[PDB]
Amino acid sequence: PTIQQLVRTGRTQITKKSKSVALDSCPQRRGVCTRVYTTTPKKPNSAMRKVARVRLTNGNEVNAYIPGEGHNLQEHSIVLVRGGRVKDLPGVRYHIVRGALDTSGVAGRTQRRSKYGAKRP
Amino acid sequence: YTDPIADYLTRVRNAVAANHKVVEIPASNLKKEITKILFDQGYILSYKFEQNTVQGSIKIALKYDKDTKEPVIKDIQRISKPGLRKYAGAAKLPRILNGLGIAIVSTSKGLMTGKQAKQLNVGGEVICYVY
RNA sequence: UACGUUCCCGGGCCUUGUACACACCGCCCGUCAAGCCAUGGAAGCUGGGGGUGCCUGAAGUCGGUGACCGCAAGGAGCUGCCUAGGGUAAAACUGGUAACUAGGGCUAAGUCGUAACAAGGUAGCCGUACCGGAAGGUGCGGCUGGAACACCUCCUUUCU
RNA sequence: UAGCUAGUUGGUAAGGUAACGGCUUACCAAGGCCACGAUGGGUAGGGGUCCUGAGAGGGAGAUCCCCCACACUGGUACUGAGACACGGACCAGACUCCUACGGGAGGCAGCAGUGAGGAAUAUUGGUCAAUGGACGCAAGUCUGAACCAGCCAUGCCGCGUGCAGGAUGACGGUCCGGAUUGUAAACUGCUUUUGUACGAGAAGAAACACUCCUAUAUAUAGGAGCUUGACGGUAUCGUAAGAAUAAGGAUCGGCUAACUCCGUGCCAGCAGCCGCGGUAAUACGGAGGAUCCAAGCGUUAUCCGGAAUCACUGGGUUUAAAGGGUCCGUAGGCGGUUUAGUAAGUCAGUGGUGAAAGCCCAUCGCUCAACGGUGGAACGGCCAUUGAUACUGCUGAACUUGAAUUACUGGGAAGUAACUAGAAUAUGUAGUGUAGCGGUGAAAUGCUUAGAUAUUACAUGGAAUACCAAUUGCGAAGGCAGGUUACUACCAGUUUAUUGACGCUGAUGGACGAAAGCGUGGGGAGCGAACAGGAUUAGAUACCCUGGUAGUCCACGCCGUAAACGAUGGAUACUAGCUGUUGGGCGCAAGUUCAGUGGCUAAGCGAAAGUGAUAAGUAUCCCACCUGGGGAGUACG
RNA sequence: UCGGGAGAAAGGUCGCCCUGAGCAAUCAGGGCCGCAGUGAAGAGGUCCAGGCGACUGUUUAUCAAAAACACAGGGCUCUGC
Fold first, then answer.
1. A1: burial class by Cβ within 10 Å (0-12, 13-18, 19+)?
2. Which of A19, A119, B77, B128 is the most buried (most CB within 10 A)?
3. What torsion do the CA atoms of B122, B10, B101, B83 make, to the nearest 10 degrees?
4. Backbone angles phi, psi at A87, to 5 degrees
C-alpha cells in the first residue's frame, strides 16, 4: 500500500512449512518396526494396504507404507524409511526402501527393477 | 493541493478522454516549462499565458487528427511523486515507449527531455513521461 | 347428474426463489453410543542451562609484617585483596511425565429429532439475556443479504 | 520482552598501560540509554563468495583467500620484541594408565588410523626432487607445510563399446496368408582410438657450495664440467595378431515424448495432481514395440523459478479475505503563488580506495574441452575536493485563491435542565342492569349470580406522543417527533472588513457510543425473558391461548458490544445530460448560481450483478485491513 | 479485598588500641587478645496444605474458651403518634 506504511512495517514473508518433518531433514532414516498391520483407504478405493509403525533413530514414531508385494517385516526388523506420503491412508506419510539392510526386494519383477530393489535377471 | 504537476497532467488527460478543445489550468513556472516542452515536442497545438489573475492561467489547445481523431496523447503519467522522489544520473534514464515517447527530466541546467539530457551527460530528476 | 373449479390428484405455459443437478425419493444440522489421531487443564513426580545474595576458598600476580637465615640486597615463615572450584537459600525461564477432565478431526454412516436451503412449512441473520436431551425457543434493539401484495380520504389559496 | 544501569553518567586529583580512557582508587553532582526498539530470550563465526532469477530479489557461508575465537573443562602468571601460549608451566575438576599404596604420567578441533553415532565420506603410503618455513657464513638438519601415490563413477569435461555393402533369412509379439522388429541379422572388405605384448622415452632442474681471469671495491657480473627426480620407466612415440577387450536405467491415460496383447476382477496393486482395478484394464503384473538420457538412469532430503502466492519494480478491500462504530488529536508523513541567500538531498568532473581469488569478454598453452596464463570490464559502495541551482529541505520577504475570524439575512425531531396538555389502557368509588365475558382453525385454561362483560360521572397513577409526517430536516456517529421557557452548540448564503499557508491525514491516546446486561435508591399503567396452566402433535422443554417475575421508566454510576450497513475511510482537483425536492442569493416572471438530499442514464470502470458528477470514472497524500477452508477468534500469557 | 502476606524466607558487623574524614554521633584504614566480642540476664522458631469460623471481642466463678454466642452486613413483617 502506502510507501510510508511499507517503510514502517514491510511485507511479511512466511516460512513455507515443510512436508516431511519427522525425519530430521535427511534423505533416508533407519528405524525399527513395532507393529506391522493393514489399513483401509478413505474412499472410494477398496484395498488392504500394508503399513508398519516405525521408530526412527531420532525417537520419532511414524507410519510407513510397504510398497509392492512380498516381504518379511516381522515384529522387529531394521528398515530404511525414505519419505513420500499417500493420498489413501490418513496418517501414513512415509515409505520404506525395498532392498535396504534387512527388508526384502521383489521376485518376478522385470519392468521397474531400479525401484522395489530387484536385481537384473 | 498535493501535487500541482499531477493535477496539471490529470486535467489534460481528462480533457483528452472527454474530447475537449481547450483547458484553462492554473499557472506556475514549472507548469509553464512543461507546457513549453510539450509544445516544442508537438503534443499540443498552442498555449496562451492569460494574465488578470492573482496566479495566472494557462490556456492549452489539444491536438487531434483531421480524420479519425485519435488523440496523440495516449498516456501521460508521473514517475516522481511527493511520497517517493526518484532521481537518476545520466545513465539510468527511462526508455519510455522504446524511444518513441518523451520523459521530462528536471536537470541542473533546466527542464529537458530524457533524450536531450543524455547528450549533455547530465542527470536530474524524472518528473513525468508522455507516450 | 355437471350449480362450479375455492379444495384432492396429474399435466402445460409465464414470472419468481433456491445452499438441488442421479436433480425434494435432494441437500444438510446437532447431541448421545463404539474405535483411531493430535493438541489443552490439572493434585503431584522428575530434570536442563544461566542469574543473583551469602560462606569457604587451590594456584598465581600485587601489598603488610618479618624477633629467623644473610655482610647489603634479598629470602624463609605468617598475613591481606582479587579470583576458578565447592556448599547453601529463595526465585525466574524451560523440557518430560501424571490419576482425572474439556474440546477438535476422521471411521461403518448406529440411536434420537428435522434446525437452515422454496414464504423450508413460525422469514432469515447480528448483538445481548434467560431456558431446554439436541439441532434450538423466547424477550429488546438493528439489517435485507426475504418472498407475495404494493400510487390518495378531504382539492386550492384573501394580512392571520 | 517497556523499562534498564549504581563505577552506572560527567567532573576534580592520584595509581597506572606501549598509548588516551572509570582501566582502578579517593571526593562532588545525578546523571546516561530507551518506541528511530534499551533490556531480556532464541539462533548464529563475519566477508570476498556459491545456487537460482530477465532484473529487482530470494536461499546458503563445504573446498580457495582475508579477519576473529578455541585447543579436555576453567583460572593465573613467567620467559620472550611479540603469548595470559595446540604439540610450554602452575592450580582445581571429570576420565584412562603405572604403583612397592607413599606417589605419579597423560590430552589427535595436527597427518595416517580405532571404537561409537549416522542414510552417508578414504592409505596406520612415498619424498624433501621443486616452492615456502626454522636454524647455520656455508656445507647441511628438520618440515604428515608442500609435491606425489592409493580408495570412492561424488561433480565437470573428452573418448570408446566399430565403418561401408548386403535380403525382406530363421525366431518372437500382432491381425484374419499379411504387417512388425528389419540392413536389423547371416555373410563380404577396411581401421586399430581404447585393451594386451615388445622396443624407445621426457618437461617439471633453476640453483646452492668448491677451484679459475676482468673491473671496481670488499657489492655486483659472465662462463666450465663429475653435479642435484618420490612420481617413474609416468606422460608420449613406434612395431605385431585381432571387431575382437566394453550399455544400461527410466517412461508410454492427460499434464508430457512414446501403444498392442495376455493374466487378476474394487482383489493384487499403482499414484507428483486429476485419479485407475467390482471379470473385454492404452493407468495393476508379464511379453512385444516405441520415446528420453547415456557410463549413467530414477527416488528421497534441502533451496530458487514458475508464485504478480507479501506485488518498490509488480495486487487488492460493495457482493469472493479485507474500511477501524464515529470524531478530536500527539509523534510522524505530505506541502498554494512569487522572490533573495546557502548548497543538505540531487547531478557532473578529479584524486584515493573498493586485496587477491571467483563470474563475464577477448586472446594464448595443455591434440579439443574441463584446466591454466594475460588483459579489460565489473566490484552498483565510501572519503576529500571543484562546479551547476532546474526540483526537494533551511533561512528571510511579499500575495490571496486554501484556511480561519468578523458583519447582515436565515435554518432546523441538534443537545442539557425545568414546567405543562389531550386521547387511550389499568384500578378505585358511586348510579343502572342481568348471564354471560374473553379467546381460537375449532376448543379449553381464565373472570363471572360474592353481580362480570356493558354504560354514565369523578378520582388516582405510569409510559408514549394519532393528524402534521415524508427516499423531509439536523447531528461526527449512536441517534433525534405533543407544547413552552432558560442555558448552549452548529450550519448555509451574501455588498462587507480582517490575518496571511495559520492546511490534509493521523500509529500510541482521549471522548462519545443502539439494544441487551451489572450496582445502589425510587416508580411500576401497558408489554413481557424465565416460569405456571389450556390447546396441537407419535412426542412439543416451540409456534397458538390465559396469567405472570426480572426488564422496559427515573437519579448517579459500570461494560463497550451490533446486519454500529451506503457490507463503499478521510481530503483536493478534473470529466455528458434528463428529472424532483430542502434551505439561501439574483430575479416584476421566466429562469440562473452556491450548499445538502433521491431516481433514469452516456462515456468510463467491474468477473458479472451493478456503479455512474453525492462514482465503484482519471490522478496525488495519509491511516486501517487482506494473503486457501476447517481447527479458531480456539489454546497460553 | 491492592491495605497486606512480611519481622516472609535466607544472610553480614558488633571486643580493645591508634590514625584520618567527620555534625555529637558515625565511617574508613591498620594493630592486639580469646574457644567464644548483642562474651552474664531480657527480647519471634520457620515453612507447606486442608476443615470450621470473615475479622477484634464474649461464654459454663470452681474439670469444657470452642467449629459455641455476639458482630458489621442482608431479609421478612408490625407500628401514623
1. exposed
2. B128
3. 40
4. -90, 25
